[PDB]
From TrEMBL, chain B:
Part of the 50S ribosomal subunit. This is Large ribosomal subunit protein uL15. Mg(2+) 3 binds at G45. It comes from Escherichia coli. Binds to the 23S rRNA. Residues 21-31 have a biased composition (Gly residues). The keyword rRNA-binding applies. Mg(2+) 1 binds at S25. Residues 84-143 form the Large ribosomal subunit protein uL15/eL18 domain. Mg(2+) 4 binds at N99.
Length: 117, 144, 64, 201
RNA sequence: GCUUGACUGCGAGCGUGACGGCGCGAGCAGGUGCGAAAGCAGGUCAUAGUGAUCCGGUGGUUCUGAAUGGAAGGGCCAUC
RNA sequence: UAGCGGCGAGCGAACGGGGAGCAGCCCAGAGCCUGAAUCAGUGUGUGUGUUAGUGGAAGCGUCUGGAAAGGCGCGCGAUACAGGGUGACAGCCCCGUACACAAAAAUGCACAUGCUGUGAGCUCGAUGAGUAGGGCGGGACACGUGGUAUCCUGUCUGAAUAUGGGGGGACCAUCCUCCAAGGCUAAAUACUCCUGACUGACCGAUAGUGAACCAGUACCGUGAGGGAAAGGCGAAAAGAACCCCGGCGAGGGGAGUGAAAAAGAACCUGAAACCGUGUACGUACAAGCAGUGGGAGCACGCUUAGGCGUGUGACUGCGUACCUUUUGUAUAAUGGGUCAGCGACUUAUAUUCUGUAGCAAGGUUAACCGAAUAGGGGAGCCGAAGGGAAACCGAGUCUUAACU
């Protein structure tokens, strides 16, 4: 039994070339380069599902510190005041209140200031 | 029971190592052979007994003994075999026609290795002590 | 192609009842007169092959 | 263990061991695969690098060209001059033990009993060798895909079913494991049941 | 001073080695030595003074002995 | 296995047993009676062939369709439903197949009978000399000079005559068995340049022969020698009448043939690298394995808002290819220009272990016969007993004078 390879080889190449669209030059046209590019994009996707959480945490903390200093307190004193009041609101929602509802954020800052002393 | 409904027992039909078929089969890139050296080469591997250039054990140790050529024509008979002699007499050749000793055997012995519960005339054979007691106990007769 | 025995191994090892091999001891052919009698007396009887050497002996003797 | 007849209305008595034992799946599968393996013709070959027509000289010298090193135009990694492990003509027959072959036949013939795939008649023959008579006869007996098995080997029945592919005709000696599974119904003669019960026991 | 234990067959159990090996050893049996005797003695206060296998040489042992009776050759033991 | 063997690597019988197949004769010599059985060439009637060949059964209606063998509804033949072709998948259209036949002429094959060369049957004799053996030197026997039998002999020597000789693994005696130094001889075995039929878990144009094709050709070499690439229109050539541009071009556009020119001969299908045209988005103050995570704007489908799909991606965080080899590689260490195709753990026979299946103190046959995957065949092999170098003994044995 002799097995020709061309159909299944063509399918295995077309899958990798389909996952390589948008890439520059031989990275979207040539199987040898596109296979390395697809594996490198996979490594980056694995690393950046971890990196995304870190970056959004950084952004939330920068906006909380911005709006807290707009209200007259630093970040560390404000998070101390929300721990010493037993308030479990995370930093995503605090950044969202810092953007969209500044009076509710002023209420939270007054709560943390009263708890801070 | 049709031909597309039969199937083997589980554990009967293990597949087999195919060597050199990628990362995920476990046996690609040198396939179980490791890296460079004489063993990984095609046709490599040292012969049977080669311990390095160190003197091998079948050459280190002395030779002993000789082959008798008399022990190649001495068979033995178990006590659970002379219930097959077709007649109840044991000779040099009716054992040889009942296919227990072989044609080139001239000397033979009966050995206590089972049970005998029939009268057997054991003629022309050497007999051990316990086999003689276990044949004389079952109502037989051992002559020379 | 039937397997051939290493014929110099068939003259130095004999198979026992559990499947081991007996062999004659070395150091008992010549300069004996400087060897003590206790040493040569222990070198006379046969010994069994050790654990590490059984693989080599079994490979050398397929039909034993 | 009693086999009824279909059209004579007078039953028949068989052995409990032959027609009434368990169906061993793995034994039947080993014997069916063994029959199909021994049915194979193994006549094939290619050429190795020793057998391709061509010269055994080095195409370009060992050092100094810009090419990879080669030694033969008959190298298996070169075009026209390949196969690395080329086939020889070989025999694919497997050994079946006598007791394993008979245990498989007993298991499959027991399942032909218990799945209502076995017919036993007194006599099944034909007066003149014409396939139209046996066509009408097998349409009478509601038999579409049928294996006739007869005690003494018949000539008129061998010619009246040689053209039919749904129908097969065998002796009680010439039974094989893969055909008693292949055909829908198996019509045995009573003499054929006696001979199979002798041959297998 | 007297002597030959610088004996023969073994060996509980250990030590040290990848193995081949090397080493320590009470006690058993046969026979001996010295001492009144209990005893001690299987070389030297101990640790180096060494060389596998094959091939053969010498003596003992009818174990084997290519039809049989021997014999040659071989085995086993002591040894080079 | 026994043995041989720098007793290393390895080499490797025989006796005996089961099968296929079986066949014995002649001269070395005189006679009786001549041709009486078998061996080689030659005319002639017959059997089997090979060499041309002959007959050879059974179907129509209708829908899609270019076209029916397909679907649908109904019959028929079959000792024939092997295979191929026919405008798509045919048992019933054609070639065929199963079965039955047919040779004026030459030839193969075992006998018959006619011719020729040769000799049936039998009394009695005889029995293969520079030979066997030996010295020296080689070679073959599984056997390498070893204690080495046996066979052949280059060279040198050299017997006896059935009251004699050879062998039985140095050699001697007994016993057993045969008669060298002269020859012929079917069968079982080996192979396929060629022929005919059939088969294939063999290949399908980089495969299979080097050669599907005008291939051992074109081409290369002084020569020996080496050695290619290259299959496909359609069902049917119906292979594009004619017209227009152009050079009485090439090429194209129509018309026409066709089911189809998304079959026009550079001809089925028509992939990828590679190269273009058009459209959407981005890009001329911005630095690096070109991605990834976030993300504005734009374009275009949305639902009848819903902050989602598809394409682009300003800006921003992180991010120095792959393979191999190494203690360690972004490494300025190796390898790859890219695509497509081929390209590397196989096969036979033994042996051990694991799983699984059958039978079980038993299991199983091999060659071969075959009514051929059955059934027979138990020749054998492994196991149920070991110990000992061995004779030998045996649930024991060896060591030893015997063993705590």
């Amino acid at each position: 039994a002799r097995v020709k390879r061309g159909v299944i080889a063509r399918a295995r190449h077309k899958k990798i070339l389909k996952q390589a669209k948008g890439y520059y030059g031989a990275r979207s046209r040539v199987y040898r380069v596109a296979f390395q590019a697809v594996i490198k994009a996979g490594q980056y996707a694995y690393r950046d599902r971890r990196q995304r959480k870190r970056q959004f945490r950084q952004l939330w903390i920068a906006r909380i510190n911005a709006a807290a200093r707009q209200n007259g307190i630093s970040y560390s004193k404000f998070i101390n005041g929300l721990k010493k009041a037993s308030v479990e609101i995370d930093r995503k929602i605090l950044a969202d209140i810092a953007v969209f509802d500044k009076v509710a954020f002023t209420a939270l800052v007054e709560k943390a200031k009263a708890a801070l002393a | 029971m049709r031909l597309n409904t039969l199937s083997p027992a589980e554990g009967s039909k293990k597949a087999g190592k195919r060597l050199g078929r990628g990362i995920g089969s476990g046996l690609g890139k040198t396939g179980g052979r490791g890296h460079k050296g004489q063993k990984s080469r095609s046709g490599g591997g040292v012969r049977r007994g080669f311990e390095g250039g160190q003197m091998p054990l079948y050459r280190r140790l002395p030779k002993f003994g000789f082959t008798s050529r008399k022990a190649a024509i001495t068979a033995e008979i178990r006590l659970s075999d002379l219930a097959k002699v077709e007649g109840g007499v044991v000779d040099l050749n009716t054992l040889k026609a009942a296919n227990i000793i072989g044609i080139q055997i001239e000397f033979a012995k009966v050995i206590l290795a089972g049970e005998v519960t029939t009268p057997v005339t054991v003629r022309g054979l050497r007999v051990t002590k316990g086999a003689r007691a276990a044949i004389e106990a079952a109502g037989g007769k051992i002559e020379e | 192609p039937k397997i051939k025995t290493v014929r110099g191994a068939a003259k130095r090892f004999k198979k026992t009842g559990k499947g081991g091999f007996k062999h004659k001891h070395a150091n008992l052919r010549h300069i004996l007169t400087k060897k003590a009698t206790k040493r040569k007396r222990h070198l006379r009887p046969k010994a069994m092959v050790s654990k590490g050497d059984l693989g080599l002996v079994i490979a050398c003797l397929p039909y034993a | 263990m009693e086999l009824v007849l279909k059209d004579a209305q007078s039953a028949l008595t068989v052995s409990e061991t032959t027609f009434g034992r368990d169906f061993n799946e793995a034994l039947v599968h080993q014997v069916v695969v063994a029959y199909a393996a021994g049915a194979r013709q193994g006549t094939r070959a290619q050429k190795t690098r020793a057998e391709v027509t061509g010269s055994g000289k080095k195409p370009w010298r060992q050092k100094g060209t810009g090419r990879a090193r080669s030694g033969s135009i008959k190298s298996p990694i070169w075009r026209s001059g390949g196969v690395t492990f080329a086939a020889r003509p070989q025999d694919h027959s497997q050994k079946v033990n006598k007791k394993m072959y008979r245990g498989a036949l007993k298991s499959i013939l027991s399942e032909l009993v218990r799945q209502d795939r076995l017919i036993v008649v007194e006599k099944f023959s034909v007066e003149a060798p014409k396939t139209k008579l046996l066509a009408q006869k097998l349409k009478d007996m509601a038999l579409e895909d049928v294996l006739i098995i007869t005690g003494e080997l018949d000539e008129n029945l061998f010619l009246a079913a040689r053209n039919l592919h749904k129908v097969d005709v065998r002796d009680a000696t010439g039974i094989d494991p893969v055909s008693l599974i292949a055909f829908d119904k198996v019509v045995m003669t009573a003499d054929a049941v006696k001979q199979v019960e002798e041959m297998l026991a």
